[PDB]
Amino acid sequence: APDSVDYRKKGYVTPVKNQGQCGSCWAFSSVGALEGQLKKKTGKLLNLAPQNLVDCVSENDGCGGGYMTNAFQYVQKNRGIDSEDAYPYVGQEESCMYNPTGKAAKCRGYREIPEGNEKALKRAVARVGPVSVAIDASLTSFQFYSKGVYYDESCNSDNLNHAVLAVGYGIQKGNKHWIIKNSWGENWGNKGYILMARNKNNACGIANLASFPKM
Numbered sequence: 001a002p003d004s005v006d007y008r009k010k011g012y013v014t015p016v017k018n019q020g021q022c023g024s025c026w027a028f029s030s031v032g033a034l035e036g037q038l039k040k041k042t043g044k045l046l047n048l049a050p051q052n053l054v055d056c057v058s059e060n061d062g063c064g065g066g067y068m069t070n071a072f073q074y075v076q077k078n079r080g081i082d083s084e085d086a087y088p089y090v091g092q093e094e095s096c097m098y099n100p101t102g103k104a105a106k107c108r109g110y111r112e113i114p115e116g117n118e119k120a121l122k123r124a125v126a127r128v129g130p131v132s133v134a135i136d137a138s139l140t141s142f143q144f145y146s147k148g149v150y151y152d153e154s155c156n157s158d159n160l161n162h163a164v165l166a167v168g169y170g171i172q173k174g175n176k177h178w179i180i181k182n183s184w185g186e187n188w189g190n191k192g193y194i195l196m197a198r199n200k201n202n203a204c205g206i207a208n209l210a211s212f213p214k215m
């Protein structure tokens with residue numbers, strides 16, 4: 001496998017977004033993975049609409065949480081997802097207002113990484129593109145992260161409470177990491193990103209609920 005991967009350097013990753021007071025991290029994670037596949041397939045990088053997912057994925061709970069796999073299935077069965085420009089993010093729940101004229105991507109299904117398998121996650125990032133993952137982001141240590149490779153041995157791999165996007169991996173001064181795009185704005189972390197420990201016993205459950213869309 002490649003020793004390091006960073007899809008930001010390939011033009012597969014849109015700017016960091018800010019979910020606001022709505023618990024829609026799952027929707028941001030899902031749009032990020034769809035954005036990466038759309039760029040890889042077509043050469044177009046475009047912001048896709050997390051609001052489309054928040055309002056329209058009936059199997060999820062809007063601002064109360066959701067699964068990325070349900071989001072991918074919705075895009076597949078709906079035969080589309082809007083661009084952000086066609087369906088802007090408002091950070092609150094509302095009726096589904098999907099508009100097929102603003103459709104910007106389709107999905108042919110989704111794939112899951114075997115639970116707990118960081119090597120498989122690394123293979124997916126290398127061969128597929130950015131991957132949607134869920135983690136335990138509840139610790140104040142995560143909340144106040146600024147730089148370096150984040151590792152907290154007290155993180156719980158079974159407490160998956162936040163969804164983010166794995167856009168790469170590498171090693172910094174001997175510490176293997178995942179490059180993670182969050183949705184807490186650019187003023188959080190390192191310009192909106194965090195490096196999370198890799199191959200440290202599935203730290204924070206990073207490989208427990210990982211998936212990507214087919215396009």
Ligand SMILES: NC(=O)SCC(=O)Nc1ccccc1C(=O)O
Pocket residue numbers: 055056057058059074077078096098
């Ligand atoms: N709660 C609602 O109003 S249904 C919104 C909507 O567009 N749903 C859908 C539309 C197309 C395909 C799948 C779904 C789904 O819910 O899974």
Ligand SMILES: NC(=O)SCC(=O)Nc1ccccc1C(=O)O
Pocket residue numbers: 112113114119120121123124125126127128
């Ligand atoms: N390019 C990819 O998505 S590989 C992801 C994946 O599911 N990998 C795997 C799945 C099952 C077993 C082993 C692996 C492995 O990669 O070692």
Ligand SMILES: NC(=O)SCC(=O)Nc1ccccc1C(=O)O
Pocket residue numbers: 018019020021143144183184185188
């Ligand atoms: N306690 C905290 O503020 S965690 C750090 C942070 O910037 N969080 C956030 C930033 C932007 C939007 C949402 C959140 C959130 O926590 O839900």
